[PDB]
Amino acid sequence: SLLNVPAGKDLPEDIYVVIEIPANADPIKYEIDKESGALFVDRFMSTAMFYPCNYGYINHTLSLDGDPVNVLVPTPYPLQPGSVTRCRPVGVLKMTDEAGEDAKLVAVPHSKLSKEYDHIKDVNDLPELLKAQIAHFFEHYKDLEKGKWVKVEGWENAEAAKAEIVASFERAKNK
Amino acid sequence: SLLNVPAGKDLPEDIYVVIEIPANADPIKYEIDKESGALFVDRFMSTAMFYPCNYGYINHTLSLDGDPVNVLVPTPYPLQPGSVTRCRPVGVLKMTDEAGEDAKLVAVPHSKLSKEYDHIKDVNDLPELLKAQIAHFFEHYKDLEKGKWVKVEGWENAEAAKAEIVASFERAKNK
Amino acid sequence: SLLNVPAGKDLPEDIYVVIEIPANADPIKYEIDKESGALFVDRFMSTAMFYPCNYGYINHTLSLDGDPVNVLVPTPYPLQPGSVTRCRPVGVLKMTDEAGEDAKLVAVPHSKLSKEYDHIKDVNDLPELLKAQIAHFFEHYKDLEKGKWVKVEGWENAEAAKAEIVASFERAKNK
Amino acid sequence: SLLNVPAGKDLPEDIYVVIEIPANADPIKYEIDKESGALFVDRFMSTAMFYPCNYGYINHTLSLDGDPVNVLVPTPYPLQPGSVTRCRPVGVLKMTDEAGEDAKLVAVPHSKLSKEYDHIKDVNDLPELLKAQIAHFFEHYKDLEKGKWVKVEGWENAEAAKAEIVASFERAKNK
Amino acid sequence: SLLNVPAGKDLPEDIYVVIEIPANADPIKYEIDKESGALFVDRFMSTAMFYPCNYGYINHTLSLDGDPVNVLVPTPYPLQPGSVTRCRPVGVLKMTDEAGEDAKLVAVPHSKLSKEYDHIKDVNDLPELLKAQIAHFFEHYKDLEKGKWVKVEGWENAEAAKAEIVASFERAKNK
Amino acid sequence: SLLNVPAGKDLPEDIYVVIEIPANADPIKYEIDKESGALFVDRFMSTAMFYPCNYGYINHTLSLDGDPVNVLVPTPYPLQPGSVTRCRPVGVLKMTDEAGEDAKLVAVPHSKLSKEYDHIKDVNDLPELLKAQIAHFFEHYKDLEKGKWVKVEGWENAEAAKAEIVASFERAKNK
């Protein structure tokens, strides 16, 4: 029951990300349906691009855009869809699309799971190649879709990311 | 909760297919257990064949054969097991086995998901190679199983497929 | 709902194993969270090893170590995570770690699913190469993890395995 | 070896394409070394894109960019690197990169290999999606490479492609 | 290159098999070009079947079908195309196709490579499943190919296989 | 062919590595046959381990173990067997096996191929995890092979690696 997974052990620095799409996956956009807790296909992108890292959501959050908060999680190996990963937020990729807000958080595995990300404390600590690859992916994977687009704005720090988690958690908690 | 996924947005022309087996999967027959909503292994086929396309079921349907209605869904890339795909029915592959009825519906992704199947309105619009590959797969994947077989009868149109969806939906709705 | 899957059709000789990790998977240790029925990432191992066979648990069991009873299931092809496989227990791999008991049961697909394991009645019937590969995997996959280790003790017969299933089933049934 | 392979059975209508990169390969750009007849790694691209179809060359040809003529070949399943495919040229994607000419022809498997492309006689017969995908891939796969770029001029017909095969074949012979 | 490889260390008991197609490969039939020593795509099969084991040839041999002797080789993991495996012939699958003779020998890896097949001394020692799978694959992989067919006469012993290796080896030498 | 490839552009700082085994490959140990220039299967390991990175050799070299110098090369994506990668040697893993010398150098892709390793100038610059993973893999992949063993003496610097490239290059020339 994905629907009974906690938002985190100690929000907002210690969170749980439920994986929707694994790293290196084909360009099929999936989305969690909170009514059923089932993953629905959104769209089969026409571009020849693959997901640069894992993509999931924080359960029990309500982003202003209506969906839970989405998170990009880089890992040693691709994660199983539906698995829950303990992470630590490090930044946010600010973007917009024809529909409005589309920011995505970036988080790294918690030290209990792996020791290789212990030194990534903020968005500026992530490899420059990884950040460029992620931003490029989002800017272009919808290129061949008519009436759809994505404008990538920039990166924001961990503090920005944490503000968003606590705000979205409360936005569903008290509502 | 696969069990809370609707049968469709607008039956029978607009349905939801819950994927059980992805396209190109190894010859392991899986089946949904409606008691638990969990996928159980049915049999490991001994033939060297792979699934020609995705295989799923329409939730909230009761085929006369006892199970939900099964659907074959061809896609640009293989779908994740347990994901829900919005489709449009285009035909049916009539078959029987030692146990009785074994017809399988064929449906294509809804236009909202992809624009490449918009021109496939009926079973006769599907590529002739695809239809031959699907029929051949079902006729032969159980070849090396003792006391089991499949006799493929032929293809029926979208109207036949739609009659089956509404009949099976009601057969579980009012029962 | 993995949580509603029966422990077995006829315990302890006829059981159901819910798959957590498929055969040949990368070294990411997953674990079932019985609160949510969701799979959580435990650890990303640093070794260059892969799972020699499928790894799952028997639902409705309570091993003394706190978790459900874990089972290793060898199959013709890798199983889908979350799928339920009907098996017959044939032995147990006795092991310990820094945390205590860590025995893992070994079971083969039930004859209804496949006929290739019908002649494996006990732990001594399994291929000698398979047993060595499994024991070696467990002895070494945690090698590069600080403060963690596994000491593989030896193999025990089907009778030992069956005693453990009935004991663990009752340990959760009457508690 | 791969240097004893003809440019074709009957240039320019009947050609042989030696595969260098399989369809769906990761973004590692390879280049044939004319002297060794060995495949050299040229560059690891930083974008998250995969090769939209098989990429190869016509042996015994020398295009303006100094390498043999390169050909993109669509197939049902990805081809093995180094295998030779009998094809029919159907068009060319005109482009220039930071170094000069960079045209890629497009050829389909010969009818003896598969009837599936028998109808593709010219550039306008190819699927619009595939053409969009190929152009988009070449337009952007080098986006994150400093100093590297690709200007896409557009598609040209079978006749333009056949003229390049003839000119390039003679350019390698009359040398 | 691959043309400087011996037919074997000690024909016909000790042979070398150059791999053309890996175990589990898609249904693309390849054929070695004797003059180039290059692998040519021969046909894309339309059936949904995969190669049951590694498929190769004995260099410096010429069977009746005009190609070198072909050998099927079972292994723990699929082999790389072009690699040379030291084997022991254990049998032959007698067949004829639309063109004439079409026998395939079966060889197991030599004891220096793996002890796992040391007990397989003859055709009757091979697993019944594997033999069933191989025959079924050759009986049906060309089912959807117009004008193409395969008549399977049956299995023959190691002696029959060794006689073909000797005759084919001499047929290429005394030419 | 692969025998017409230079040992390097400027030994020992600028070398070419011909790939034999891709990163993440199954435990099948291959060995280059100097006379054929063909890859021979040497042994199927029984341990459940995968190659931690690409494994190759420097053409026109002859190390003490009788084979050309072997090199481990880390890359963003696994390389194709037989492709040639321009590298920079950065260290050597000193080891001995049951037969004698068994050192493996470590080289990183040249800056023309990727900027990603430009900072790796010496052995101590490589990630500690990767080095741990490589040593652990060589220490244990032959554990289940009777009579086979590997003693790992430790890492050595770029200078030690360059001295071996020079000595091995001359040992093959002055022969």
From Swiss-Prot, chains A, B, C, D, E, F:
Its main location: cytoplasm. Mg(2+) 1 binds at residues 65, 70, 102. The keyword 4Fe-4S does not apply. GO terms for cellular component: cytosol; membrane. GO terms for biological process: phosphate-containing compound metabolic process. Keywords: Cytoplasm, Hydrolase, Magnesium, Metal-binding. Mg(2+) 2 binds at residue 70. Coiled coil: none annotated. It holds the Pfam family Pyrophosphatase. Catalyzes the hydrolysis of inorganic pyrophosphate (PPi) forming two phosphate ions. Belongs to the PPase family. Homohexamer. This is Inorganic pyrophosphatase. It comes from Escherichia coli (strain K12).
